[PDB]
């Protein structure tokens, strides 16, 4: 399944990835563009 969490002011990619137990470098490396990372965008974590 894909997990998407939409990022908040205050939330980390790796303290989101925390969340979950994901690698936010799986994060990255799946996704070329995390320039959406806005407070109020979601992100994608296939990270397992």
């Given at each position: 399944?894909?997990i998407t969490?939409?990022?908040?002011k205050?939330?980390?990619l790796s303290?989101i990835?925390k969340r979950?137990?994901?690698?936010?470098?799986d994060?990255?490396?799946?996704?070329?563009?995390?320039?959406?990372?806005?407070?109020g965008?979601?992100?994608?974590l296939?990270?397992?």
């Open positions: 399944d894909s969490y939409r990022v908040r205050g939330d980390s303290s990835a979950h137990g994901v690698n936010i470098k994060v990255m490396r799946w996704n070329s563009d995390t320039a959406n990372l806005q407070p965008d979601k992100l994608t296939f990270v397992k």
